[PDB]
Amino acid sequence: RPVPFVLSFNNLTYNVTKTLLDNISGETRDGEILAVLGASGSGKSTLIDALANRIAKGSLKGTVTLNGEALQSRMLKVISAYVMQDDLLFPMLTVEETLMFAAEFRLPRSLPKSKKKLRVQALIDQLGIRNAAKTIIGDEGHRGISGGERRRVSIGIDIIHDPIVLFLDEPTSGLDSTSAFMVVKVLKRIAESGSIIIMSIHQPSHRVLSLLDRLIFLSRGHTVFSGSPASLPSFFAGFGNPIPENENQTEFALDLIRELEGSAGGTRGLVEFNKKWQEMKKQSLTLKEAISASISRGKLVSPAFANPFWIEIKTLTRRSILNSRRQPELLGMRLATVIVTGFILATVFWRLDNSPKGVQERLGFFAFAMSTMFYTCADALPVFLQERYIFMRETAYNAYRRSSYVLSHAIVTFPSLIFLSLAFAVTTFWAVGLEGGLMGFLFYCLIILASFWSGSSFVTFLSGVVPHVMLGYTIVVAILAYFLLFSGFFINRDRIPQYWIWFHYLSLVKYPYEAVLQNEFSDPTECFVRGVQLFDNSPLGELTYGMKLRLLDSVSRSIGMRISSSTCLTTGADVLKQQGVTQLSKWNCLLITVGFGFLFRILFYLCLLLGSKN
Amino acid sequence: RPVPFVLSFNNLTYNVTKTLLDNISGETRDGEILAVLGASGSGKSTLIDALANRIAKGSLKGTVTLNGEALQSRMLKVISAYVMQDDLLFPMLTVEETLMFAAEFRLPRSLPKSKKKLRVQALIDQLGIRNAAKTIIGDEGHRGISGGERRRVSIGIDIIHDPIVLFLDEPTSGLDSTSAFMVVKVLKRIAESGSIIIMSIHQPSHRVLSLLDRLIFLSRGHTVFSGSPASLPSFFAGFGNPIPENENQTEFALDLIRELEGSAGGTRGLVEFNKKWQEMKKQSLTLKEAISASISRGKLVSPAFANPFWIEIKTLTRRSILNSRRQPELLGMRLATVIVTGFILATVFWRLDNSPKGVQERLGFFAFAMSTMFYTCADALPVFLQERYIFMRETAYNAYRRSSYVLSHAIVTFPSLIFLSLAFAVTTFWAVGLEGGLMGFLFYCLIILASFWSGSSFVTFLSGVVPHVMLGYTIVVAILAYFLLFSGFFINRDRIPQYWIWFHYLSLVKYPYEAVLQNEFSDPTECFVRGVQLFDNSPLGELTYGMKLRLLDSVSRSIGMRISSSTCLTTGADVLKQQGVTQLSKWNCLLITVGFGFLFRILFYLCLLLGSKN
Ligand SMILES: CC/C=C\C[C@H]1C(=O)CC[C@@H]1CC(=O)O
Ligand SMILES: CC/C=C\C[C@H]1C(=O)CC[C@@H]1CC(=O)O
């Protein structure tokens, strides 16, 4: 015996004015399924949105009462669930630990973990997915479970607290009819446990129509039929056109409503015929304690969040580790890109000399190397966009905080950024022949790591403002190119016009590039022009060694400074003065690179606030 | 009265061994539709591929005879058509001129154009698309015709010669059942004109099943049912499980075959039951002149190609012009990208002086400008991939040559490349302050045009080897970056190691970059170092004007050459010697850029040869 529940909704009118819903009425009990149909663009997605209070409230007029009293929004977040229309699952998780991660986010922390696992096992048996309980979910290619068992996993995630009311936006969409029958046979099994099912459906078959107990047909937001499937031949016989034998009901009726959308009559005669057809059928408790009676029967397993701030971080981190450990070809293809790019740069710029052309080749190596770190952070854009679509599904249920999501996402990607930074520094420090020994190599690893951190924080921020991968990849490639034009390599800082100098200081390439230059040209003992090398790239100075030695001391008669054959005119400190790299220290350039990464994680948080209302 | 035709096929076995088809048999007449069903992966796409001789011939064993004799491949290219499974249409064309372009490619040139237009008008009435005859076809967003009328346009393109046999791979795929009924009602109308229809179908309804006259159900390449729809209750009653009332036939039968794919029995009992069920129904001309009789009735309207080589170019060019004239926001968004990139570069590099830092800023302007021309050619990759999918549909019918496609594609894109080249040269020649006057500006326009020509030829070639836009866009961005590293700007040609110099000469950026450098530093009257400017970037030379004047003549005592206060040491010819730009002339650098574009149009032709067998 389940506790009886009755959901009644009357006079639902929704204006946006476009009047998308007009005088909808209905009634649903437990043990039954109310199916809503009618067209594409008919308003059935808007009808179950209005029944679930997921609207811009203040535009809906009408009463929605459960068991007699009312439905405010704070009761409907405890006893209801809304399964949205698609599957958005992590592919490398088995369906037992997919449902177990949902239990840790939503069921209370007062419940022991042994009883949480018992709820998952009882839900695996109630759904039709006992046969594949340790198979991974899979994707395009990893060979997991089928499309009809993925649908019962995404349904079973949303019913983890075992609600009393269950809203479903087209739960059989995209399935073949032998797996679209097992979905509705599971939804009939949930209804027999004491639940109220309200679902949208496109084209029900003859098999799933025996399981639906009530039907509502809509025609641009007007109800044109309301009743059992075994009243549909009796309904349209009174309208003037009965249903033939060996024809699918709710299919000829669905075609007749689309046929009656012409220009002479319209469906207004059918809206008026329905609202007096219901008038021929007129003849024929204790909601706060009825809910509490059902918790004693064993239904409602389940503060705004079930866990504190630190439990949600360690659960989100463990899920992201377990999902990327079982895909060890995403990190392997990122290691292989960085090593090949570093191997090419190390063999082109192999062992640069202390020539004036080797100084300009050092600046070109560093400008190209810093720009590859920011570009190779853009291949995380498809996986950064898979989540934030799963995240937007789970924050409708208050599964975890918005702070715990951004913090655990910044934590799990940081071990991969250390391996990428160490792989690029090992391939390029000793082969290009950079300066510093061991302390210069360690600063080289730190600023490569700070560039991977700020470049992935920038792509994380872009993955919250773009809809698809191609738009966000175009924006990365375009803005990185202008970060390189304004980095001080193509045109120096003291030569950039003053109406463009605001974008020089906003360049994400400028600060790591100015840090590796000051790490490189830091020794006072390095020398790039000695003695007779004053006359190399001038027309004066195509002469012999003995001829330029009297060219040197003939300059010493004028000034008084004696320039020997080895005087060390141009050092590394003079290279940085020629390029204009003088304003910030190399440790202050490292801190602006780390600080730019933190700013793009904060702007990513602020776009997840606005992305919930959008 | 139509001429009678009979298509009979027996003992079709196809091994690849995986035996994808095993002992298929059937018979089809005119006026009737043979529908093939059974599963996903069942082999129904392979069955109509074998009936249309579109296989690797030599692996099929079995006889396929039309009207008694045989079917070799040269008769089946005159009297048959194969409609493939999707719509691939140009969106800006009305459906009258979409069918009129198909008539000019396939109907013979002996036919007058007045009779070609009469064939299009008679086909518009036979299809269900008289109501939208001048509506454009449309796409994702341009609001053309509906999805069910797009299907009858793509069907009507393939029946433009009015064949006798019509193969159809799932012609109702992706349609709602009120538009999937009008497709089969049109296919029944074509059959009544004297045609043989053989189609695949997923999930027929109760309405389209009345139009199909024969059914063949397959179960991994074995026939399990063969007969009329009004023999399906009688068939499965003898198997042990009849069909219930108010259940869709060919749906319960389709589910039972999927149910009988278990592990104990299998469908082998049903394959054996079918091949003796057909044995209980055993009791109950002049093909070369039967075809010629039907041409007299008015069916077959239609050399390997219907038009000469030059008529196909002027028809393909007119179609590409008419399709892009009605989309004047693809060229407008390409003008807007080039002008904004040119405006940014002209205000950063505004009016460069004849300083040693203005020389290095000229090299960075030219390296950045030449790299934007090759990048902005990559936004033609989605439209270059829409065609070559339409082209691969139309070369199954020999609509036009492979030479006419590549030549007219290189012709229609060239007026847009002239406007892009003139827009970049106008924004940047006078603002950066480049040298040459008018003859230097005209060479500047020519090498920007040669860079747009070779960069779009490179993207045209990539659009014949990549499947999707995201892979080809990743390859462009990666290879352009290494074309810039090896262009001589980051490291000069005489400093590149000899194991990498093969890729320097293959760089697409090197030759236009070396042409604008030699156009710029060509005047013998330009000067970048004069007199006392010998001591600018050295520690010698932080002195006054009078102090360096005795530094000048003190060098003249040694050599004998007198260096005045104005001697013009470094000219533009010395800048090119310092960069190593000495091997090729600027006209020979322009010709290698034009010649690289022609090579990538030839490699694009050679990938359309291999792309037909692939
Ligand atoms: C060093 C970058 C080379 C060329 C610059 C171009 C890109 O690489 C991507 C964007 C830029 C053109 C644009 O979009 O304005
Ligand atoms: C001047 C180009 C700047 C950085 C180079 C990176 C790109 O811009 C695209 C590819 C390259 C990294 C790679 O893919 O190896």
Swiss-Prot record, chains A, B:
<dbReference type="GO" id="GO:0010208">
    <property type="term" value="P:pollen wall assembly"/>
</dbReference>
<dbReference type="GO" id="GO:0016887">
    <property type="term" value="F:ATP hydrolysis activity"/>
</dbReference>
<dbReference type="GO" id="GO:0016020">
    <property type="term" value="C:membrane"/>
</dbReference>
<feature type="domain" description="ABC transporter">
    <location>
        <begin position="17"/>
        <end position="245"/>
    </location>
</feature>
<keyword id="KW-0067">ATP-binding</keyword>
<keyword id="KW-0812">Transmembrane</keyword>
<feature type="domain" description="ABC transmembrane type-2">
    <location>
        <begin position="311"/>
        <end position="521"/>
    </location>
</feature>
<dbReference type="Pfam" id="PF00005">
    <property type="entry name" value="ABC_tran"/>
</dbReference>
<keyword id="KW-0813">Transport</keyword>
<dbReference type="InterPro" id="IPR050352">
    <property type="entry name" value="ABCG_transporters"/>
</dbReference>
<protein>
    <recommendedName>
        <fullName>ABC transporter G family member 16</fullName>
    </recommendedName>
</protein>
<dbReference type="InterPro" id="IPR013525">
    <property type="entry name" value="ABC2_TM"/>
</dbReference>
<feature type="transmembrane region" description="Helical">
    <location>
        <begin position="450"/>
        <end position="470"/>
    </location>
</feature>
<comment type="similarity">
    <text>Belongs to the ABC transporter superfamily. ABCG family. Eye pigment precursor importer (TC 3.A.1.204) subfamily.</text>
</comment>
<keyword id="KW-0472">Membrane</keyword>
<feature type="transmembrane region" description="Helical">
    <location>
        <begin position="330"/>
        <end position="350"/>
    </location>
</feature>
<feature type="binding site">
    <location>
        <begin position="38"/>
        <end position="45"/>
    </location>
    <ligand>
        <name>ATP</name>
    </ligand>
</feature>
<feature type="transmembrane region" description="Helical">
    <location>
        <begin position="590"/>
        <end position="610"/>
    </location>
</feature>
<feature type="transmembrane region" description="Helical">
    <location>
        <begin position="406"/>
        <end position="426"/>
    </location>
</feature>
<dbReference type="InterPro" id="IPR017871">
    <property type="entry name" value="ABC_transporter-like_CS"/>
</dbReference>
<dbReference type="InterPro" id="IPR003593">
    <property type="entry name" value="AAA+_ATPase"/>
</dbReference>
<feature type="transmembrane region" description="Helical">
    <location>
        <begin position="365"/>
        <end position="385"/>
    </location>
</feature>
<dbReference type="InterPro" id="IPR003439">
    <property type="entry name" value="ABC_transporter-like_ATP-bd"/>
</dbReference>
<feature type="transmembrane region" description="Helical">
    <location>
        <begin position="471"/>
        <end position="491"/>
    </location>
</feature>
<dbReference type="GO" id="GO:0140359">
    <property type="term" value="F:ABC-type transporter activity"/>
</dbReference>
<keyword id="KW-1133">Transmembrane helix</keyword>
<keyword id="KW-0547">Nucleotide-binding</keyword>
<dbReference type="InterPro" id="IPR027417">
    <property type="entry name" value="P-loop_NTPase"/>
</dbReference>
<dbReference type="Pfam" id="PF01061">
    <property type="entry name" value="ABC2_membrane"/>
</dbReference>
<dbReference type="GO" id="GO:0005524">
    <property type="term" value="F:ATP binding"/>
</dbReference>
